[PDB]
Every structure is written in C-alpha cells, then in structure tokens.
Amino acid sequence: QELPPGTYRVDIYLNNGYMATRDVTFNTGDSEQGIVPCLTRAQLASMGLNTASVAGMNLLADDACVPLTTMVQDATAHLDVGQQRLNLTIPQAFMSNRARGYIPPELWDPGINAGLLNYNFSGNSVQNRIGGNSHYAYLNLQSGLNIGAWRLRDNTTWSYNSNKWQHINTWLERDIIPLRSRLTLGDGYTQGDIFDGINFRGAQLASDDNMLPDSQRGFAPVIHGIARGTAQVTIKQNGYDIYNSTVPPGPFTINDIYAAGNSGDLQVTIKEADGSTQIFTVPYSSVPLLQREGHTRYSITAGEYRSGNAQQEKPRFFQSTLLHGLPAGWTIYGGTQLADRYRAFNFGIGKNMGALGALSVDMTQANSTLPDDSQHDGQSVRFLYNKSLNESGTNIQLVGYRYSTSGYFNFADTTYSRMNYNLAYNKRGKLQLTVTQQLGRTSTLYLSGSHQTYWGTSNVDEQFQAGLNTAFEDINWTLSYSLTKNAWQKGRDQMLALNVNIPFSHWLRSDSKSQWRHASASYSMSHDLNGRMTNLAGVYGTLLEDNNLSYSVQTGYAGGGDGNSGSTGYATLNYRGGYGNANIGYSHSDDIKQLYYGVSGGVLAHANGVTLGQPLNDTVVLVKAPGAKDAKVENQTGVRTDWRGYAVLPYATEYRENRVALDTNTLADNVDLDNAVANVVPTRGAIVRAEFKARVGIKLLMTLTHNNKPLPFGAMVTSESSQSSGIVADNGQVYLSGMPLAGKVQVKWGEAHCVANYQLPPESQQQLLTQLSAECRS
C-alpha cells in the first residue's frame, strides 16, 4: 500500500548498515510506496555512494533531490513507519571504500617530532694459522630527524683494521597522501621493473602500495557480476575458502581478493535469496608487472647517477615509468629514460589470460653513446610467462626470455669512463626458468635455470639448479643439485647438497616445560663433485622464559678438493633485551680461529626525554606509561619498559591499526592501569605515542555497608587521598587501585551520601588484592 507524502523522523539505513537519524521529506513519486525520499548528492556521497560512478549526478544543484531510483539502476528505498526506519539499498558497484581493511586517510597519524639514532657496535678477532693475529671493529650509525611529516635520515659507518669514517647515505622523505605517493629527496633508488634500477642523488615522486589496504595490494582478478536480490558472494581458491561477504541487489565489483598469483583458479559462487546460485570460475595466473584493475603505479625521477662504481661517471638524468590496470585483466605500461649520452623509451602490454596463464611483453628502444664516443641504436624485447598451480600440481612460476639487438645498451653501459667488464661483448639473449612440481602430499620438485648468449663470442652463461624437498612428519628433508657454466672461465661448477631438519617440539609432551621443545637438530652435507666434501651436524633454538636468547651450535668437517682437510665448529648467541641487543659468535676452521662480539640498539629523543631499546625500524611506537617499570609489551620479544615506564617498539605496521598492549602479568603487584590496551594508526616513519595510565598503590575490593545493608549497585565511589575512583557492583563491592595504606572514601548515588574510612594492617603490602569491609555515615 501507498503512504501519504510528508516529513518523517526516521533511521536511515543503507544496505542493512545504519547511517544517520534525520527528518526525511517524502514526495509523491514513481515508487511502490507512492513516495520517494528526498536526498542530496552531498548526503548520498557521504553515506558511501561514489557519485562519479553514476551518470548525471554531477549536473544536479547542491540541494536538488536526487531521483535515486531512475538515476541508479537497481537502487531501492523502503519506508517503515512502524520502526521509524528508512532502508536504502544501492548496488555496491556504485559504492566507494568497499575494500576490507579500509582505513580513512585522516586517521593516519604523522606522529611526534623527535630525534632518532640506531647504533650497532660490532667487532671480531682472528687467529690465523701462520701470520699471527688480527682485530676488527665496525660501528654503524643510522641517524634520524622527524619534523611533522618529514623524515630526515642518515647512514654513516666507522671501521677498524689492524680506519675511517666512511659516510654512506642521506635522504629527506615525506608522503603526499592526496596523491597516495612518497616524495624522496637526496640519495634514493629506482625500481627494476622496466629499466634496470639505478642508484641516484636527486628527487623522486612515486606512488606507494603501502598506503593501500592489504586486501587490494598486488594483482588479483577483479570480479564483475550482478546479484538479482540480496546475495551471498563466496570465493574459493586452492580448495580452501578465500572470500565471503553479502551484497545488495544490482551490479557488484569485487576488488578485494588478496594477491595469490600462484595459488590457482578462483571458484566464485553467488548464492541468492531463493537458494539459486551462479557458479563460475575465474582463472588466476600472474606476472610481476600486472596491475589490479584501475590501479596506477607511477614514478618520476630526476638526479645524478651514483652507482658507487669508481670506474663510472655521474650523469644527470630523467626517468619516469607508468603502469596501469585496465578491465578484463589487461595492463598497459611503459616509461622513458633521458640523459645526455642515452635516451630510452619502453612500452608494454600484459594480460592475465585465464586458462592459458599470464603474459607480458614489452619493448625498449635505446639510443646510446658509448665511452669511445660512438653512437648506437638498439632494441630489447622481453616476454614473461606465468602459469599458477595446476590440477596436476605444476606451478610454472616464471618463464622469461629477453632478447637484445647488437646496438642495444642500458643506461649503466654509458656511464662508464673507458670501453674495456667489456662493452664490445654486450648480452644478446636471456632465458630464465622456474618451475615447481607437487609429488604427492609431502614432496616438491624444484627446477630453475638461466642461459645468456652474447654478441661477439659464442660463449654462453648456463646455470641450472634442481632440488627435491620432502616432509616426513615434522622433519624436512632436502636434496639439491646445481651446475653453473660461466662465460669468462673454463670447466663446470657443481654442488650436490643434502639437508635434514628435525624439530624436537613434537618429541615431548605438549605441556612440556623443557627448553628442548624450542630446539631442533640439523644435519647437512656438501659435495662439489670435484673431490671436496663437507658435512655439518648442529643444534639451534631459543632459551629463557621470554625466548630473547637465540643459539646456534654446529660442528662438522670438510676434506678434499683443494687439498684442505680438517674439522670445523661454529657457534652464535644472540640476545634481544630491554635496552638493546648483544651477539657473540665463535668460529673454528682448523686454520683460522675467530671470535665475534657485538652490541646494537635504538635511541629516541622526544618531548619526555631519551628512551633506549632494541634498534628501530622506520615506524616507531613510543610506549608512555609512567609508573610501569619492568612492564613487558605483548608480541615484541624482549621489549620491556625502562625504569621510567618508557619503551620504544622495534615493530609496527604503517597505515594500519596497531594494537599496543602491556602484559598485565608482568606488572608490579601494586600497579594497575586504566587501560592495558592502546591502539595507533601511524604513517611510514612516524613516531607515535601509546599512552597508558598507571595507578600505583594498594589494590582493594571493598564491601561497603550502610545500616548493615550493602551500598546499592551503580554507586560512584571516589577517594580523598588519591586520584583513584570506582563503581559499586554486587554485594556492595567496589574495586580500587592506586590506594594508600589508610584513607577516607567518598560515595555518592543520589543528589554526596555515605563516607567510609579504612586502615589496612601494614602486613598486607605483598598481596595482590586485599578485601576489607567499611561502615558508613548516619
């Protein structure tokens, strides 16, 4: 039945999800209920709709009522006065921010201003058979400054040999969020996607994957479909279920599938309201250059070429590359490379072809000037073939073929100072190959090889490595062979290897408290098929109650080949603690005999002082919990707060939410926290606080009574002596932390009432929680 037009106080729902409560105007319209809600482009866009994906909506005035049902195919509105409920449905294809793991950009915290140092002090002592002794020391300094969203960083090392400050690196970096990009000034590098990677000093503007929800990263097929009514979308791959969500009626686009480019075909199934389905398969192979539909990877760079090869110049240059993801699994891409002595243009096409697998083909036109001032023209084509995991357990991971004409060169080739490495013998054709093969549940055959022809010589660069890897319960077993025939030498190079890994975990009861459960034996052999054989038995694992201590011990013996025989021994200890890391290593090679020792750690200078810890990793969470001294941080081995309640975490993930919890088990008996869990959302390189409020003092569960009857539920309780307070639950009990040995307590439910006092006998200090009763006023 129709309703009369008018204004209705209503709860607006879009696709079963609440949006807002407002009074909504309903006008007579082409509709089942005779009336249509008036909603604006403004209001619809904020509710989730992506307006540009809908033809015409850009034309309407700001406050014009949108003709939702005629303007958006399969969009529906229903009004229910009975619940005061307006239910809207718009097909998800027209919705924005559909990705799972999605986090709005404005929550991305750039972090606090800070000073930042990583120190690694390491050295080793050698005792040589004939010759005597040797001492070596090395110090690595990774330096840093954060101002707002800018990150200045520096690398410099110090050396000693029985010595100079050799500086390495510097850059200033920042993210440009509206462009989803990263600006890098100073020393940086280019990617090896299209042109060979270059190290350089200058400026770079580049798109950053890190900023996307993990569910959208890399290439996966984007599935387009239509759902008759409200439908359930499920996807499976490699047997196991990999996707599941419900979708509104109308067209839908699923851009959310996690990249799994080697795992196999996607079996989509669309279960409808009535119970009818759509069952189709989306094949899924992938080559590294492919972009997810509608994704653009780009980079623009200008600067000087700084390879670190002293036999090379430092030419200024410009490079830009662009890769774009199109519908139907297509990718177009290419780039340019301009320099005084070199210009190059690349263009490529690539497709997830489905059943035939995945392929990309690109072409590079290169115009070059060599160091002898001669000029060359050349081209290079490259084919990359992938086929993901078969029904027959074949995974053709990579087939590659590059082919280059005589006059073809790379930018690097022109940076040289002298002709003679030799530029007369540049590379002709290269075939890369990596295949794996399942052989039952437990085994895996691995084949990989590469082959390089050249212009001038008939000298090739063969190389081949096969390998078999079997699981036997816990135990992994590996046999492998490799044959490498280089260009500028004679005779084969071979290696035959066998390795066995036995973890001890499943050898003891699962309750086992013994440290052996964290240990594994290892046995292995080498034989270079040229007389020389080596073999090594070892033990490795972790120790201590938190597993901060890592050890490796292994003794073996190598003999033959070079005429060098004798036993060998290797050991390492490794400690991850509150204030930094420590290593010891020991090595015995029958002739050489050496000792390794090292200390490492991170330093942070911030508004509330200097805090030390394990070395830092770009993105730093600063735990600020004054009063929680030796408090452990969950999931971060060896990380503890210092004598002030400060810590620096070695591990956080940018552009995502990061749970930061204190292990309440490790708290002092007289310490409780207002909140044991904090949550942060840092940018890359960001330094963010995670704050915890510690109440230090006695913990008590008070039974409060008044005229021999317990105080009512919900009663607010607040201390006179401390900043602590509580609420009365059942039996007239309240919990209080950070309390004094004796004190007065104010209680109020109606509108101040009862007041109680207490005095705990000194002997109750060691206790976690003491229970005492207290009378009241009147």
Partner 1 sequence: GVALGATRVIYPAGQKQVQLAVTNNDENSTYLIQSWVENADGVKDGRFIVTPPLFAMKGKKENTLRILDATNNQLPQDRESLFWMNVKAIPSMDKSKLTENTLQLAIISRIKLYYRPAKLALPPDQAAEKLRFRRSANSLTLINPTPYYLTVTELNAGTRVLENALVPPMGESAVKLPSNITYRTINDYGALTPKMTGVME
Partner 2 sequence: FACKTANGTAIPIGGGSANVYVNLAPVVNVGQNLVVDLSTQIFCHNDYPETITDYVTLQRGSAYGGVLSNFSGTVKYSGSSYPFPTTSETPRVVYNSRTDKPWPVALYLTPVSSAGGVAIKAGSLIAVLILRQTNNYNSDDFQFVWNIYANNDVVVPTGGCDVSARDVTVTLPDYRGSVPIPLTVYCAKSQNLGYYLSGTHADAGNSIFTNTASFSPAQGVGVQLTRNGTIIPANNTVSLGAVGTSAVSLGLTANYARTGGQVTAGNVQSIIGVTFVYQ
Q: In whole angstroms, what is the distance from residue 339 CA to residue 302 CA?
A: 10
Structure tokens, 295:
């994704």
CA 139 to CA 120: how far, in whole Å?
Answer: 6
Nearer to partner 1, 510 or 708 (CB): 510
Segment interacting with partner 1, rule: CB under 8 A, options 257-265, 330-338, 526-534, 656-664: 656-664
Q: Which of residues 509-528 bind partner 1 (CB under 8 A)?
A: 509-511
Distance CA 520, CA 432 (A): 36
What SS3 class is residue 10?
strand
Stretch that binds partner 2, among 341-349, 496-504, 663-671, 740-748 (CB under 8 A): 496-504
| Residue number, 59 or 768, with CB nearest to partner 1 | 768
Does residue 83 bind partner 2 (CB under 8 A)? Answer: yes
Interface with partner 1 in residues 389-448 (CB under 8 A): none
Using CB under 8 A, which of 52, 592, 668, 729 touches partner 1? 729
Per-residue tokens: 261: 């480019």
Is 481 within 8 Å of 466 (Cβ atoms)? yes
Scanning 334-342, 533-541, 720-728, 733-741 for contacts with partner 2 by CB under 8 A, the matching segment is 533-541
Residue with tokens 């482009």: 41
81 contributes a contact to partner 1 by CB under 8 A? no
User: Which of 679, 723, 757, 765 touches partner 1 (CB under 8 A)?
Assistant: 679
User: Using CB under 8 A, which of the segments 353-361, 635-643, 663-671, 721-729 binds partner 2?
Assistant: 635-643
Check binding of 672 to partner 1 (CB under 8 A). Answer: yes
Asked if 254 touches partner 1 (CB under 8 A), the answer is no
- 142 touches partner 2 by CB under 8 A: yes
Count of residues in contact with partner 1, rule CB under 8 A: 25
**CA distance from start to end of the chain:** 65
Q: Which residue has the tokens 């590379």?
A: 427
The distance of closest approach from Cβ of residue 19 to partner 1 in the complex, given in angstroms and rounded to an integer, is 12
Cβ proximity of 97 and 575 under 8 Å: no
Q: Which does 675 bind (CB under 5 to 8 A by kind): partner 1, partner 2, none?
A: partner 1
- Smallest distance from the beta carbon of 245 to partner 2, in angstroms? 8
Interface with partner 2 includes 635 (CB under 8 A)?
yes
The residue type found at 778 is S
Of 249-257, 362-370, 430-438, 722-730, the segment contacting partner 1 by CB under 8 A is 722-730
356 touches partner 1 by CB under 8 A: no
CB 237: neighbour CB atoms within 10 A?
23
Figure out which of the listed residues 82, 132, 327, 750 binds partner 2, where binding follows CB under 8 A: 82
3-state secondary structure of 518: helix
Question: Cβ neighbours of residue 593 under 8 Å, at least 6 residues apart?
Answer: 126, 127, 587
Instruction: Compute the least distance from the CB of residue 743 to partner 1, in Å.
Output: 19
Locus of tokens 């990359």: 384
Binding mask 158-197 for partner 2 (x = CB under 8 A): ----------x-------------------xx-xx----x
- Say whether residue 387 binds partner 1 (CB under 8 A): no
Is residue 83 close enough to count as binding partner 1 by CB under 8 A?
A: no
**Are the CB atoms for 266 and 352 separated by under 8 Å?**
no
* Residue in 659, 744, 748, 777 binding partner 1, rule: CB under 8 A: 659
Alpha carbon distance 456, 461 (integer Å): 14
Partner touching 331 among partner 2, partner 1, none, CB below 5 to 8 Å by kind: none
Per-residue burial over 124-161, b if 16 or more Cβ lie within 10 Å, else e, is bebeeeeeeeeeebeebbbbbebeebbbbbbeeeeeee
* Residue with Cβ nearer partner 1 (478 or 733): 733
Q: Does 665 bind partner 1 (CB under 8 A)?
A: yes
Binding string, 751-770, against partner 1, x = CB under 8 A? -----------------xx-
Nearest Cα residue to 652 out of 583, 602, 609, 610: 602
Does residue 403 belong to the site contacting partner 2 (CB under 8 A)? no
Distance in angstroms (rounded) separating the CA atoms of residues 356 and 353: 6
The full DSSP string for 216-275 is GSS--PPEEEEESSSEEEEEEETTEEEEEEEE-SEEEEE--PPP-TTT--EEEEEE-SSS
Q: How far is CA 651 from the centre of its chain?
A: 10
Q: Footprint of partner 1 on this chain (CB under 8 A)?
A: 509-511, 659, 661, 663-665, 672, 675-677, 679, 699, 701, 714, 726-730, 733, 735, 768-769
